[PDB]
From Swiss-Prot:
Auto-ubiquitinated. Auto-ubiquitination leads to degradation by the proteasome. Belongs to the RBR family. Component of the LUBAC complex (linear ubiquitin chain assembly complex) which consists of SHARPIN, RBCK1 and RNF31. LUBAC has a MW of approximately 600 kDa suggesting a heteromultimeric assembly of its subunits. Interacts with beta-I-type (PRKCB1) and zeta-type protein kinase C (PRKCZ). Interacts with UBE2L3. Interacts with IREB2 only in iron-rich conditions. Associates with the TNF-R1 signaling complex (TNF-RSC) in a stimulation-dependent manner. Interacts with EYA1, TAB2, TAB3, MAP3K7 TRAF6 and RIPK1. Interacts with IRF3. Residues 47-66 form a coiled coil. This is RanBP-type and C3HC4-type zinc finger-containing protein 1. Disruption phenotype: Impaired TNF-alpha-mediated NF-kappa-B activation and enhanced JNK-mediated apoptosis.
């Protein structure tokens, strides 16, 4: 999960400069729901674990709502 990296490509957290993943609707420190305004970078490229869970989550969530 979003443990932390030197060159993050997600969104920055105001409550703390942790910067979580772009596809992570919630900081792993403050738990502040990602701002809908924020967008995900096309060149994101989620890790093997990130995509493994993301691709599946959206397959059950996105497929429903979106
Ligand atoms: Zn936050
Ligand atoms: Zn935070």
């Amino acid at each position: 999960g979003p443990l932390g990296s030197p060159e993050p490509v997600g969104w920055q957290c105001p409550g703390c400069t942790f910067i979580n993943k772009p596809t992570r609707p919630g900081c792993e420190m403050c738990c502040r729901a990602r701002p809908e305004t924020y967008q995900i970078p096309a060149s994101y490229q989620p890790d093997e674990e990130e995509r493994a869970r993301l691709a599946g989550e959206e397959e059950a969530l996105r497929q429903y709502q979106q």
